[PDB]
Ligand binder design. Structure first.
Ligand SMILES: Nc1ncnc2c1ncn2[C@@H]1O[C@H](CSCC[C@H](N)C(=O)O)[C@@H](O)[C@H]1O
Lengths: 259, 127, 32, 225
């Protein structure tokens, strides 16, 4: 198991998602009707990680939010004031995202991307080169069983685009600097690029382990925002557009939309 | 559609430097076969020949400060003079003030004597 | 030292200039 | 001093060997030796703050009948010689293109200002190409930053004019390059392959090029060209 695909996906053995806590004091789950129209300063305060787990529409046929929805969303100073915004970026609306977020005091500081590798393309390459005759790509994600690809650039999820094909998922990181306080950081504790496996039909669905890698990137960059006994009722990590897949997490404020 | 060879030749003719491209627009590969800053232009070769005509061989300092304006390697001047005279070690010609026609005569007789001695390596008479 | 002047990232011209400068310095030392 | 005499003999032998090597190199060069630079490459060695872009405009108009289809730059970002952000903005890119793409390689410190640059030149940011640095054994060549380890280089792409005219292709190549570090600022040749997939047989302009950037049908501009 020393091939390129096995080497680039070896982080998955060390980033298993934890069980969701049964302790109500270890998180704050908030259900909203419209996050963009919801005042969040009454739900949190002085958070250091505003992970916006947004899904963008881009095309009119599919669902998701829009740049107007990001514009209407209020991120105040009584909300996150010394912290990072983690927001899923797209190539079409990267300029609009950075414009609207630098309108709200959040300046771009870092790019954290996921190199999209396709399990279906890896399976089709294994079938063309040749236990893998009947296995779903979702089963490949969940059983951690992957073909021994030695050239992963042929199994990039090269999704449809009017331009260069979309084979990466960018998590934009933007900091609102505070001149009165200090964001206690850990520097260079994780790379800005990691390879994670994806599905061909779901290029925007990060896996459980990839989402855990993102969460541990956030929680390693900001350790004082983690679940400590001093952070009880005053959690420093918040998620917008939360899902029941990973967000009931220790030390995290989960904001859902229309549950 | 346009042919890109003639297009590149014309664009190099009116845009690229005289060292980058030749007189017909063709790429001068000698420019890109040496590091930038040391190419030994044909003007440099002509200046070296003028220096050997005006000053003696082995007078690289006064050659450099009268035909290259001090922006030339003395070692490179000696090496080029070796190439245009045909001996790896130019010791007999040290301070002889060789003109153009005599330079070519020495080069031709030198290549001939190198063929006679059967020791020509790169059109230079090996010692 | 021959190590600093025999590097493979140096062209033959700069290698030869380094050789000739070292030769001049050691000839001066010989005359000393 | 017998040891210094022996060292003198040693360097005399090295002088003779390297003299023969130099003579062989100059005899090969003068006779027929061709450099690695392609024949249809158009190199321009000039400073972009001093380059007359009007001459490039006129030559490109009369010799190609149109303007450039792809413009690529790896700007010397202020932290070889460097350039200010305003100085890179002052380059008349708007005149150099009417329809096509721009390819600006952006470091992390100069990413948002790169987006602003391509917006201020009249382009609309539609794509980015990220170069993931690779090791010899096939892993990610991790680096260093302030928040995360930097193992990426992003080439932000802005679009202009009427691109849908049959000169440019859609749904081509990838936005990710997984290539080894083969230099110091040396971007991979995969960006040139991807550009040629984007606009086959097109007119390309490269600003801040080096001798490894010289390609077929590419007008390359650099300080050290
Ligand atoms: N004012 C200026 N005009 C033109 N070129 C310049 C310049 N200032 C810097 N440069 C050049 O711009 C280049 C930046 S590094 C370019 C690296 C190249 N893209 C590669 O892939 O190898 C260097 O060659 C530098 O010397």
């Amino acid at each position: 198991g020393e091939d390129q695909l096995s080497l680039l996906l070896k982080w998955r053995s060390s980033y298993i998602p934890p069980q969701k806590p049964t302790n109500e004091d270890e998180y704050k789950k908030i259900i909203c009707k419209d996050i963009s129209s919801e005042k969040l300063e009454q739900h949190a305060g002085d958070v250091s990680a505003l992970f916006i787990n947004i899904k963008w529409k881009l095309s009119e046929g599919q669902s998701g939010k829009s740049i107007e929805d990001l514009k209407k969303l209020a991120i105040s100073d009584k909300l996150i004031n010394n912290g990072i915004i983690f927001i899923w970026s797209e190539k079409e609306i990267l300029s609009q995202i950075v414009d609207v977020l630098e309108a709200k005091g959040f300046n771009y500081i870092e790019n954290f991307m996921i190199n999209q590798l396709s399990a279906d393309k890896a399976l089709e390459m294994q079938r063309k080169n040749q236990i893998w005759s009947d296995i779903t790509p979702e089963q490949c994600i969940e059983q951690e069983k992957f073909p021994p690809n030695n050239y992963v650039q042929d199994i990039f999820v090269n999704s449809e685009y009017s331009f260069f094909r979309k084979s990466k998922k960018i998590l934009l990181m933007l900091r609102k600097f505070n001149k009165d306080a200090q964001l206690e950081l850990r520097h260079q504790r994780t790379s800005d690029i990691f390879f994670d496996i994806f599905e061909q039909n779901k290029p925007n669905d990060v896996s459980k382990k990839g989402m855990e890698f993102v969460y541990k990137m956030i929680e390693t960059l900001l350790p004082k925002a983690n679940y400590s006994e001093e952070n009880k009722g005053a959690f420093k990590m918040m998620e917008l557009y939360a899902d029941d897949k990973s967000q009931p997490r220790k030390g995290w404020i989960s904001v859902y939309e229309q549950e | 559609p346009l042919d890109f060879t003639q297009y590149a030749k014309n664009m190099r003719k009116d845009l690229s430097n005289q060292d980058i491209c030749l007189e017909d627009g063709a790429l001068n590969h000698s420019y890109f076969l040496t590091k930038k800053g040391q190419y030994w232009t044909p003007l440099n070769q002509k200046a070296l020949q003028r220096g050997i005509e005006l000053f003696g061989v082995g007078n690289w300092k006064e050659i450099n400060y009268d035909e290259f304006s001090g922006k030339a390697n003395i070692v490179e001047l000696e090496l080029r003079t070796c190439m245009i005279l045909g001996i790896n070690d130019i010791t007999e010609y040290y301070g002889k003030k060789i003109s153009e026609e005599e330079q070519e005569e020495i080069k031709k007789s030198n290549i001939a004597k190198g063929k006679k001695e059967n020791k020509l390596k790169d059109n230079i008479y090996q010692k | 030292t021959l190590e600093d002047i025999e590097n493979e990232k140096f062209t033959n011209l700069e290698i030869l200039t380094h050789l000739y400068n070292l030769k001049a310095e050691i000839v001066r030392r010989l005359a000393e | 001093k017998k040891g210094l005499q022996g060292l003198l003999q040693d360097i005399e032998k090295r002088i003779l060997h390297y003299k023969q090597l130099f003579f062989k190199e100059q005899n090969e060069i003068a006779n027929g030796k061709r450099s690695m630079v392609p024949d249809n490459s158009i190199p321009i060695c000039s400073d972009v703050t001093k380059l007359n872009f009007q001459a490039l405009i006129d030559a490109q108009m009369r010799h190609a009948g149109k303007m450039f289809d792809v413009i690529m730059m790896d700007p010397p970002w202020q932290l070889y010689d460097s350039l200010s952000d305003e100085k890179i903005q002052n380059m008349p890119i708007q005149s150099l293109q009417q329809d096509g793409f721009i390819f600006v390689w952006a470091i992390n410190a100069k990413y948002r200002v790169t987006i602003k640059m391509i917006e201020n030149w009249g382009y609309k940011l539609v794509d980015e190409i990220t170069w993931v640095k690779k090791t010899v054994n096939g892993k990610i060549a991790k680096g260093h930053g302030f928040y995360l380890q930097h193992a990426k280089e992003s080439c932000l792409i802005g679009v202009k004019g009427d691109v849908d005219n049959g000169r440019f292709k859609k749904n081509i190549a990838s936005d990710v390059i997984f290539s080894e570090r083969r230099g110091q600022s040396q971007k991979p040749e995969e960006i040139y392959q991807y550009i040629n997939q984007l606009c086959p047989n097109g007119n390309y302009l490269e600003i801040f090029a080096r001798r490894n950037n010289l390609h077929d049908n590419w007008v390359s501009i650099g300080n050290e060209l």
